[PDB]
Design a protein around this nucleic acid. Structure first.
Ligand code: ZN
Ligand code: ZN
Ligand code: ZN
Ligand code: ZN
Lengths: 79, 74
DNA sequence: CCAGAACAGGGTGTTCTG
DNA sequence: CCAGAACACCCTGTTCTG
């Protein structure tokens, strides 16, 4: 009830439909509004926690998608 | 030969005793002075090529070390 | 030609405003 | 509360100077 589902830092609200911190929120929005042609250097399961979230934007974006994050979630909730 | 021995980008000279590119050179200096204790997010065997050298400072640093980089190139 | 400094770009993170 | 914007910092990479 308190921590980000993407990196396990302290959540700051339900953003794009999921509990996340502010840094995961803006990271997702940026990935979604632009390009997200990232490449993993490991095996697409990089551990995304508070520090290492910087290491692999590929895995970080994957873990946002897998958690259900989507921009329209707030509008959709109102329906 | 003229590719960087850490990330395989085009090398720019012999830096800290190893053929490397500029970004790796300064990455390595920054790593040593910073004492950041990088931690890998995978299995300590990340691929470090040009397109991915930013992804893992722990592995990039380790790879600098294994390549023989050292701040006193006599 | 190379180390370190200075300057620059890219990527990430926090506070503000609707 | 939570959206996007504006402001801010961190991390990486290139050109300058000793
Ligand atoms: Zn997060
Ligand atoms: Zn990854
Ligand atoms: Zn390199
Ligand atoms: Zn690694």
């Amino acid at each position: 009830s308190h921590m980000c589902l993407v990196c396990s830092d302290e959540a700051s609200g339900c953003h794009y439909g999921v509990l996340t911190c502010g840094s995961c929120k803006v990271f997702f929005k940026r990935a979604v509004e632009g390009q997200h042609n990232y490449l993993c250097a490991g095996r697409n399961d990089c551990i995304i926690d508070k520090i290492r979230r910087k290491n692999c934007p590929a895995c970080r974006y994957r873990k946002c998608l897998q958690a259900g994050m989507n921009l329209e979630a707030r509008k959709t909730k109102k329906k």
